[PDB]
């Protein structure tokens, strides 16, 4: 792991596996999320709406 490789997700780790992007362009929760960290089944698509654990609790 190169120290320059960006980290992501709730877990603050580099990219690995399947990842999903928070729909919020201004996401402050980690932008991209490893499927396992967010309860998604590996090697599946996710066609519809998805917010990360932070953005899904933000007031609208």
């Amino acid at each position: 792991i190169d120290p320059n490789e960006p980290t992501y997700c709730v877990c603050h780790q580099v990219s690995f596996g399947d990842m999903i992007a928070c729909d919020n362009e201004n996401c402050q929760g980690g932008e991209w999320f490893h499927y396992t960290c967010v309860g998604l089944t590996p090697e599946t698509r996710f066609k519809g709406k998805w917010y990360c654990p932070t953005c899904r609790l933000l007031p609208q």
Binding site: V14, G17, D18, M19, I20, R45, F46, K47
Partner: peptide, 9 residues
């Protein structure tokens, strides 16, 4: 949602 598969397991 946008999803991706990355090389690293």
């Amino acid at each position: 949602a946008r999803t991706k598969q990355t090389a690293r397991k």
